[PDB]
Amino acid sequence: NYLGNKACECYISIADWAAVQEWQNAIHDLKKDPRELQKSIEVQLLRSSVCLATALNPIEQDQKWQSITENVVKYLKQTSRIAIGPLRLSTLTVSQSLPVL
Amino acid sequence: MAGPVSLRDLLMGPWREDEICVVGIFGKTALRLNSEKFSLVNTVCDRQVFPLFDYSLLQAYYSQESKVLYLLLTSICDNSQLLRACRALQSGELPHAEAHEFWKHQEKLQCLSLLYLFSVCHILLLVHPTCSFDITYDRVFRALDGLRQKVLPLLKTAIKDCPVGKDWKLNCRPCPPRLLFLFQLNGASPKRRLQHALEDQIYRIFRKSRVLTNQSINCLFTVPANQAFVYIVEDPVGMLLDQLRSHCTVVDFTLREFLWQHVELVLSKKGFDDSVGRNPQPSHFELPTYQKWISAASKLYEVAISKILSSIKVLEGFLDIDTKFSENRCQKALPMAHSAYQSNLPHNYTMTVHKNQLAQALRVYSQHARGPAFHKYAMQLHEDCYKFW
Amino acid sequence: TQSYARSTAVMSMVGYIIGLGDRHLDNVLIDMTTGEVVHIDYNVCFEKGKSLRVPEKVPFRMTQNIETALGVTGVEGVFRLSCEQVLHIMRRGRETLLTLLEAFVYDPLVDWTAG
Amino acid sequence: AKLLPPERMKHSIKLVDDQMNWCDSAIEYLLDQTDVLVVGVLGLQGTGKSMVMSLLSANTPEEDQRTYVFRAQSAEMKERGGNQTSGIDFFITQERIVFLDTQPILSPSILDHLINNPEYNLPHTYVEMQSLQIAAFLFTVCHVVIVVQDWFTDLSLYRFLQTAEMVKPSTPTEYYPHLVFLQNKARREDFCPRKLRQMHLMIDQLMAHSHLRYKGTLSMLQCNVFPGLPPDFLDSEVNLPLFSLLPGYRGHPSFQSLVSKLRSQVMSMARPQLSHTILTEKNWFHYAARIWDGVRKSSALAEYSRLL
Amino acid sequence: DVPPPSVSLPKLAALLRVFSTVVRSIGERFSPIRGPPITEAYVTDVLYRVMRCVTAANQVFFSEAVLTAANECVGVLLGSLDPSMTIHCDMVITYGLDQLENCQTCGTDYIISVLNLLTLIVEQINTVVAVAHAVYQAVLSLKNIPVLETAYKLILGEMTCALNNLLHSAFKNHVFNVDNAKFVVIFDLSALTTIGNAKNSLIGMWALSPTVFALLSKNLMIVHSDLAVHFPAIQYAVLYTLYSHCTRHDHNLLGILLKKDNLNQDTRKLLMTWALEAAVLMKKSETYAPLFSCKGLLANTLVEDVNVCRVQLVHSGTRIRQAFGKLLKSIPLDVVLSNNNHTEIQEISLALRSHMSKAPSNTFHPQDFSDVISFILYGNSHRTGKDNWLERLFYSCQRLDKRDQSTIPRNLLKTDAVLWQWAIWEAAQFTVLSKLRTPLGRAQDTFQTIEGIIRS
Numbered sequence A: 001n002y003l004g005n006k007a008c009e010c011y012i013s014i015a016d017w018a019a020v021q022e023w024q025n026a027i028h029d030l031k032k033d034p035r036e037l038q039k040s041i042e043v044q045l046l047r048s049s050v051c052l053a054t055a056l057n058p059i060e061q062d063q064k065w066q067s068i069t070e071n072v073v074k075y076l077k078q079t080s081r082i083a084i085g086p087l088r089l090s091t092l093t094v095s096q097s098l099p100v101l
Numbered sequence B: 001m002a003g004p005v006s007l008r009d010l011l012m013g014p015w016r017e018d019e020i021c022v023v024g025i026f027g028k029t030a031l032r033l034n035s036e037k038f039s040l041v042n043t044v045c046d047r048q049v050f051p052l053f054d055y056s057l058l059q060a061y062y063s064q065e066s067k068v069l070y071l072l073l074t075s076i077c078d079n080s081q082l083l084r085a086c087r088a089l090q091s092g093e094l095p096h097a098e099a100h101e102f103w104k105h106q107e108k109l110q111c112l113s114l115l116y117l118f119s120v121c122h123i124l125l126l127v128h129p130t131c132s133f134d135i136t137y138d139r140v141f142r143a144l145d146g147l148r149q150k151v152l153p154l155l156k157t158a159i160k161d162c163p164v165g166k167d168w169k170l171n172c173r174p175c176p177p178r179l180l181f182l183f184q185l186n187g188a189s190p191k192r193r194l195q196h197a198l199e200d201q202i203y204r205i206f207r208k209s210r211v212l213t214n215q216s217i218n219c220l221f222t223v224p225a226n227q228a229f230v231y232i233v234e235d236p237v238g239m240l241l242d243q244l245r246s247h248c249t250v251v252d253f254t255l256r257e258f259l260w261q262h263v264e265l266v267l268s269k270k271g272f273d274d275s276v277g278r279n280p281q282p283s284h285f286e287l288p289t290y291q292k293w294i295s296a297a298s299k300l301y302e303v304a305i306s307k308i309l310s311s312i313k314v315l316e317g318f319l320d321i322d323t324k325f326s327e328n329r330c331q332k333a334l335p336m337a338h339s340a341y342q343s344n345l346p347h348n349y350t351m352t353v354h355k356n357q358l359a360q361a362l363r364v365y366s367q368h369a370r371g372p373a374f375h376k377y378a379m380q381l382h383e384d385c386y387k388f389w
Numbered sequence C: 001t002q003s004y005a006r007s008t009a010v011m012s013m014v015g016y017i018i019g020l021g022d023r024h025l026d027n028v029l030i031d032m033t034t035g036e037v038v039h040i041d042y043n044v045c046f047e048k049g050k051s052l053r054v055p056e057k058v059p060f061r062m063t064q065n066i067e068t069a070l071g072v073t074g075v076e077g078v079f080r081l082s083c084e085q086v087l088h089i090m091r092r093g094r095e096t097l098l099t100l101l102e103a104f105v106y107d108p109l110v111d112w113t114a115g
Numbered sequence D: 001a002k003l004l005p006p007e008r009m010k011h012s013i014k015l016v017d018d019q020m021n022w023c024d025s026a027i028e029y030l031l032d033q034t035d036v037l038v039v040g041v042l043g044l045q046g047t048g049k050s051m052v053m054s055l056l057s058a059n060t061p062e063e064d065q066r067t068y069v070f071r072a073q074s075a076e077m078k079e080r081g082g083n084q085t086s087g088i089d090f091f092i093t094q095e096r097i098v099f100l101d102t103q104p105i106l107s108p109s110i111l112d113h114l115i116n117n118p119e120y121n122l123p124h125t126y127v128e129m130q131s132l133q134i135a136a137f138l139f140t141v142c143h144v145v146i147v148v149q150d151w152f153t154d155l156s157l158y159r160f161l162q163t164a165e166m167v168k169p170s171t172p173t174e175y176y177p178h179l180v181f182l183q184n185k186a187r188r189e190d191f192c193p194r195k196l197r198q199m200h201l202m203i204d205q206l207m208a209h210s211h212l213r214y215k216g217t218l219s220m221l222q223c224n225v226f227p228g229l230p231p232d233f234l235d236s237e238v239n240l241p242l243f244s245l246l247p248g249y250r251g252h253p254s255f256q257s258l259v260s261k262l263r264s265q266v267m268s269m270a271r272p273q274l275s276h277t278i279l280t281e282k283n284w285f286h287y288a289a290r291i292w293d294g295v296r297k298s299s300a301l302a303e304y305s306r307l308l
Numbered sequence E: 001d002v003p004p005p006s007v008s009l010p011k012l013a014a015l016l017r018v019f020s021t022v023v024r025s026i027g028e029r030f031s032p033i034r035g036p037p038i039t040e041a042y043v044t045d046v047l048y049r050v051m052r053c054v055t056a057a058n059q060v061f062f063s064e065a066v067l068t069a070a071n072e073c074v075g076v077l078l079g080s081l082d083p084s085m086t087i088h089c090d091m092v093i094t095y096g097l098d099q100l101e102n103c104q105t106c107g108t109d110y111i112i113s114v115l116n117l118l119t120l121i122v123e124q125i126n127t128v129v130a131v132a133h134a135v136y137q138a139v140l141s142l143k144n145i146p147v148l149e150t151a152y153k154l155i156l157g158e159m160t161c162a163l164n165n166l167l168h169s170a171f172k173n174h175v176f177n178v179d180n181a182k183f184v185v186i187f188d189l190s191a192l193t194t195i196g197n198a199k200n201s202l203i204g205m206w207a208l209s210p211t212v213f214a215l216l217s218k219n220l221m222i223v224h225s226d227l228a229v230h231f232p233a234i235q236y237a238v239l240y241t242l243y244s245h246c247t248r249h250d251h252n253l254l255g256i257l258l259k260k261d262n263l264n265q266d267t268r269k270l271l272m273t274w275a276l277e278a279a280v281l282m283k284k285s286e287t288y289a290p291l292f293s294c295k296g297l298l299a300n301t302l303v304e305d306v307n308v309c310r311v312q313l314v315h316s317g318t319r320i321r322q323a324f325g326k327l328l329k330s331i332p333l334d335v336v337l338s339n340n341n342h343t344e345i346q347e348i349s350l351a352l353r354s355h356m357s358k359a360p361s362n363t364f365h366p367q368d369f370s371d372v373i374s375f376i377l378y379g380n381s382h383r384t385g386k387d388n389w390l391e392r393l394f395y396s397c398q399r400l401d402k403r404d405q406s407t408i409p410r411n412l413l414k415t416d417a418v419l420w421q422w423a424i425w426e427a428a429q430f431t432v433l434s435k436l437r438t439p440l441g442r443a444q445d446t447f448q449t450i451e452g453i454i455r456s
């Protein structure tokens, strides 16, 4: 969602990727129009997935875990913004007996 | 009932006269299932004469419904006989000089078989699936006038006792054969202009190279008509695969008018008077018959396939330039390099010292030998071996 | 390095419980890809290294200088000492699964326990 | 951030003018690097020798033709002949890979231009000298010679390449570059195992005595489970509900895939040392200019012109 | 080709059987005719009549094509009769024949697959022919990764994507299960091979429909690598990983491949390195300005001058090999990218200190000031690249340490690294801990377990 470049330090996107989902989530309660929300979420997923794109650079395991959850929740928000959230996503995060979590 | 064969065709002793009009078909072709010449023969007569599936195996076929005797040549330039040549040259017949001489002999046999078309024929159809006039043919056409003239008496003295007539025996051919080049398309109204462009290019080339003179030259101009056809871009097995996609879901002459416009000038005795320059207009139509044409072609083939004709191949000097260039390079490198290293390197002591200097005498000659060379190497090791003891 | 330390600790606990010996720089291999440590055939096992015929060594496993410097800090009070305790806890809790296995491996017929 | 200033091109640059005149406009884009790849292309009139260079150096198969560095044939094909590439062009990709899209050797358009308007007796024996001059300059300077061919087994091409080696001026061991035989505008037949074997046999028998590295590192990138049947050599061919949306059976690899797999080979081609020194991108231009003067006024051609 | 339909379409199966038998016999007799030229054993000798025709030429291709295209008349609705050789089963009885040597022919495999897909489009899955719905997947999984030409995967993957939409359109077919449990295992392999950018999309979208879920671990391992392909497949992989399932991400198969590839690349010492090309890489690591306008893919194929790695070359593999090559090129005495050694080392130290202090402070610089979306996320990529660069430099900078078999000797210059000692700079410039703990935690223990241990 074109995060503020005002000295956006490296790896701080965890807050920028979480302080934005509330924007595309608090607006749902203000209205429930959404055409300007998918462009603010899909363009937000395009950046939230960067944390996982670096999880393969140069070589890392399944991690990270606290960031992939943000990507999944942003995808859930974008799916619930397009429609009214009839069936999915929820999403499903049941054990999942890793079990560090 | 007609058999696509030339050697067996001339060995004959039905359609006797037929007022035939022979058409030669030469040129290069790519590796495909159906050769270009075969496709042309099949499309002209409107029937599949040659059903689809290192010599110039020249084959003839007469069409009774059109009175045309198509003579297609398998010159080494073609990629069908060239494949068998490279196969026979791979396992068992060669050194560099021997391979170069083999290719030269193949090209000479091709030129001989081609002179058999420029000597007994009416129309000629080239084949070059590129849409670009191969300039090499120029040096070939300029290399056939020499054979067509020097080997002219050798052919007149062998066709005297023939009913061909006076003009045929005079110029050694029924009439000036018209070249009708036929190029295939690869990527492209738009074709109508390309034909005229190629015609103008070929005309300018043959005029600047003396390949198309204003007299009874080996070829003709064909200014009024057109002599540059462009095939449409089918041949391999892909029509069935293209028909699966349809079964699962559920002006601009074409090989006949472009060729008949010239075949009528010979079948109707109109002739080939397409000459420019206010010449004497020598136009002997000479519409031959199957019997007379076979009688003439038998002797033409027996003489060219050759007592003196075999001795005229050296009179070309236009296609074997590589051999002469390599010979001159060797003659300039031997007396220079060997003569230098025989005096620059003293090696006065002759006891087991010849090879000590020859090891470097070859390093210097190798840097000046080119093409079909190193034959002097055998003629040069003697110099370094005859000066010592 | 973590997978290494873990496999080293598990193999050390095995060589402590089981009398694994003959631990040279050849019998103790190492997988440079997975980091785990593989041990060659246990020709000297069950405390047989204390019967030679060879200077009697009493190391429960290999903890040479080129191995203690491999973990984060060391061996004792380090990542490996914190996982060996968990190994013992998970093994003592199921001590019968090994006691019965050894009782059936012993008193054998074609095991050749005369080593 | 200024100690690493790069430099790139936008369009081709002609070293040899239309009248075979060396140009010094390429030094501006040259650098002081040692390993500089120089790939040249030779072919017939409409053999497509610039589209290949354009798709290999900078452009890609999915891009407009006008954007190509080397001008392709769009409206000149339908008009009088072709030969849109007058002289030898120049282009250094970001990878410092020099490309030389020379003019069509033995092209009728050049002969027509000469006839319509030079120290010779006939223009026909002159278009063969320019072809030889470009083939010798592409062998003594380039590391790879991409012999493009519209149709396969043009015996004239194999008999001319063997004549260009004879003119190759040595003594600056004789340096002989590679030979990549591109079958531009290849049909579905050329991509068959039997056709591949026939082509390899033919090109090995025709080029049996060339001394040029025409075999060894090509033709084994994108194929079937095929093991090496023939004596493999440098030969890379370049082609020309849901069930209803099934593309026809091309029979050959995708154009994009073949372009990519040929560009990878061209970039990975062996870059042997030059005549006698490293000849960095700057020294190379000072080494390719002297070769041009030595070949345009050489004795090999002066003697070959008399034999024509 | 119309007579074949006119003969096989009409009623009176007493004659349709003869017509079939004859056509299928001509087919299964021409097919072995190419055996001698291929030196293969004659197979499919069960439908051939007494007709020993000898084509022994390209005529076999056309004959087989005309005999198979004619069979479409029976493999099209309605045709409420199956008294023939069951062309549904005929297209599979010739599998071992027209699919093992089909490469040397490459003309019959695709036509057979097209005929089968046509026969299946009218009826695909209903549960009388019952094993068909399972035989389809059982034949696809076998014919899905017998690596073939691009004209085969483009249709196999299309049929698979079309069948996936029917599976989730049915319903217990998922528990078959030797077919689906392998039809998806082969999807996992086809998700990367080959690298066409068109089959992956046909696989990322074909597997996106299945939930499934049986072996989502392989799908996650594939997505973890495809999320960086740098092509339109990135979006497909992202949408597949976000829709497949959670708790299995977060659950190794593919990452080990890249690990082994990098390990094999780090043990050759190919000193080409395109010294002039390493400058455009430092300008991309220490600065954001990209000098090569994809550009990484054009580098690997340029490097190593054949004449290594797999055919993936996308993208973490090449992204790390670029840094490894830049480091191998910096190992020599002078780093042409920068000034002399003491200048490049000083530049690196300054670029690391101006970024480590940024943690306990706020400062602007080219490492964090990105005035565009999708690029501020590249700043983290810059930090990761710089950390990996320093790590692999310390790797190759052990010419004095005398690296073990993991890395072969550097070069004849193995003395400069011994005469001169760069470990002093590494010690006096251990600020990499701060600049690393931010982007990647584990990027500090490598240096933290050294500075914190060397100072015993």
Ligand SMILES: Nc1nc2c(ncn2[C@@H]2O[C@H](COP(=O)(O)OP(=O)(O)OP(=O)(O)O)[C@@H](O)[C@H]2O)c(=O)[nH]1
Residues within 6 Å of the ligand: B187, D044, D045, D046, D047, D048, D049, D050, D051, D052, D071, D072, D073, D074, D082, D083, D084, D085, D103, D104, D184, D185, D238, D239, D240
């Ligand atoms: N080589 C090639 N040309 C194609 C293909 N498809 C269409 N063409 C057309 O064929 C023409 C020949 O290609 P080019 O390489 O650009 O021709 P060129 O390099 O300029 O060579 P010259 O004809 O001598 O000027 C092009 O202008 C294209 O428009 C193809 O697949 N390969």
Ligand SMILES: [Mg+2]
Residues within 6 Å of the ligand: D049, D050, D051, D070, D071, D072, D084, D085, D101
């Ligand atoms: Mg061009």
